[PDB]
Ligand binder design. Structure first.
Ligand code: GNP
Length: 358
């Protein structure tokens, strides 16, 4: 049985600049607020810090993070750099094509380099995602669509008008019927007022497409345990409630080893939540997210295939409604879209046809 995650990864790449929304791809979309710790969740899954830091404003455009598992024997000759020590982990950006990044600091820098631009349109937020593959023996096969974080207070309770278009961007992504919403919220807050959960209920009223991740369990007030948060007595969400403890900024600056932060999280869970510890934590989260995505993709695969074909026939017949002038150039901008879309759909069906196992 062919692994389906790599297939959807390639489809994501195929529909990058051309418009992937109408495809309604099966994917996990990460919704979090400011100070929720969703960037840390991603880094917990990667096993490295790689996301741009901080201080402040930052991270406007979506990031499609594609974690690809490799064998520990599968390594890369690094850079040029006058060395040749074989590298165990590397990264690739779709914008830079086949270039290899063996230094995660150059990975973090390229993200900064691909973000924060004006981008030559008049906005503060761009809908165009960054595509980053991470090859590592320390990661599970998993892809996440990281969206720009919201303010932790309602949009009207803060002075920036731009927050609206941030909400629009998130809504645009999570309105995808085949998207799974990963809602990130800190245990440190009134969790039934999370902006992440609230905006998720706007497209998923009952939370049947939503999985809640509870971060910052180590930061709660004296003599609270969110056992209720562990229960999902309180949060109306169906795909699960998973509590984690990521590394703090203190830990990163101190260069806390990830092997040490992992067992520290585990030990914290064992102590504070003994009857629940086995269904919480970073490692657990990585495993159920992997299984969830695999099961979700195979569920959506048959409809995805026909939709690509249905879309193809529509765009082609639409090209015969536009349909001119037969000129080599200056044909149309709308005609150019449909042709570019048809080309991408062609690549999509090709990728899908290249699956075979029963
Ligand atoms: N103690 C502790 N600190 C955490 C945890 N998760 C995140 N943090 C810290 O609290 C902050 C959370 O923000 P971050 O992780 O960047 O995610 P974010 O809020 O989506 N991103 P940002 O606010 O930077 O735009 C970070 O400075 C991080 O170090 C956690 O589980 N425990």
């Amino acid at each position: 049985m062919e692994a389906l995650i790599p297939v959807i990864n390639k489809l994501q790449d195929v529909f990058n600049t051309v418009g992937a929304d109408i495809i309604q791809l099966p994917q996990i979309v990460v919704v979090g607020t400011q100070s929720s710790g969703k960037s840390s969740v991603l880094e917990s899954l990667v096993g490295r810090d790689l996301l741009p830091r901080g201080t402040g404003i930052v991270t406007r455009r979506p990031l499609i993070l594609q974690l690809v598992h490799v064998s520990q024997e599968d390594k890369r000759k690094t850079t040029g750099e006058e060395n040749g020590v074989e590298a165990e982990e590397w990264g690739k950006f779709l914008h830079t094509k086949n270039k290899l990044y063996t230094d995660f600091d150059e990975i973090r820098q390229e993200i900064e380099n691909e973000t924060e631009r004006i981008s030559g349109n008049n906005k503060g937020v761009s809908p165009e995602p960054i595509h980053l593959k991470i090859f590592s023996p320390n990661v599970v096969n998993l892809t996440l669509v990281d969206l720009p974080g919201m303010t932790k207070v309602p949009v009207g309770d803060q002075p920036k008008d731009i927050e609206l278009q941030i909400r629009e961007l998130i809504l645009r992504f999570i309105s995808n019927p085949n998207s799974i919403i990963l809602a990130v919220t800190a245990a440190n807050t009134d969790m039934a007022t999370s902006e992440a959960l609230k905006i998720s209920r706007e497209v998923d009223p009952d939370g049947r497409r939503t999985l809640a991740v509870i971060t910052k369990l180590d930061l709660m007030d004296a003599g609270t345990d969110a056992m209720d948060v562990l229960m999902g007595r309180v949060i109306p969400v169906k795909l699960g409630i998973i509590g984690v403890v990521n590394r703090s900024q203190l830990d990163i600056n101190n260069k806390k080893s990830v092997t040490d932060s992992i067992r520290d999280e585990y030990a914290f869970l064992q102590k504070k939540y003994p009857s629940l510890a086995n269904r919480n934590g970073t490692k657990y989260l990585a495993r159920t997210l992997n299984r969830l995505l695999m099961h979700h993709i195979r569920d959506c695969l048959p409809e995805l295939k026909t939709r690509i074909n249905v879309l193809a026939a529509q765009y082609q017949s639409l090209l015969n409604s536009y349909g001119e002038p037969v000129d080599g150039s200056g044909s149309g901008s709308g005609s150019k879209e449909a042709a570019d879309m048809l080309k991408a759909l062609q690549g999509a069906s090709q990728i899908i046809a290249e699956i075979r196992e029963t």
